[PDB]
Amino acid sequence: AIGIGTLIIFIAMVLVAAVAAAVLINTSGFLQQKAMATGKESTEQVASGLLCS
Amino acid sequence: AIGIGTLIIFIAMVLVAAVAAAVLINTSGFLQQKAMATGKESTEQVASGLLCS
């Protein structure tokens, strides 16, 4: 009798961990974009300019 | 984390020293002209003349 239930709740544990992992993976992706963008943009700003002759 | 910023501000140090150097170089140029001019002119003045016979 006991055995049956153990299996069922095990399935839930798996799925819930999976769902949480998805958040972390996705979020890391979302940040990767902006992280790079900010650095490149900021460098181009400080480095570039024109000079009166 | 720290490394990133060090690089960026280094760039600024370079450019600011460059801009200051430009002033000194240019200014020296501006003075070179007048310095010479004054000497030549002044000599020609003291040396030249006419005499009644």
Element (H, E) at A40: helix A2-47
Asked whether the beta carbons of A46 and B11 are under 8 A apart, the reply is yes
d(CA B47, CA B23): 37
B7-10 own/partner pairs: CB under 8 Å, 24+ apart: B8/A42, B8/A43, B8/A46
How many angstroms separate the CA atoms of A42 and A14, rounded?
43
Size of chain B in residues: 53
The residue of A38, A40, A43, A45 whose CB has the most chain B CBs within 10 angstroms, and thus the best one to mutate to test that interface, is: A43
Tokens of B47: 């040396």
Are the C-beta atoms of B14 and A49 separated by less than 8 Å?
Answer: no
Interface residue ranges in chain B relative to chain A, Cβ cutoff 8 Å: 4, 8, 11-12, 15
Name the amino acid, one letter, at A23: V
Count of CA atoms in the C-beta half-sphere (13 A) of B53: 1
Residues of chain A with C-beta less than 8 angstroms from the C-beta of B12: 46
Experimental method: cryo-EM
SS3 B11: helix
**CB distance B4–A39 less than 8 Å?**
yes
DSSP state letter for A9: H
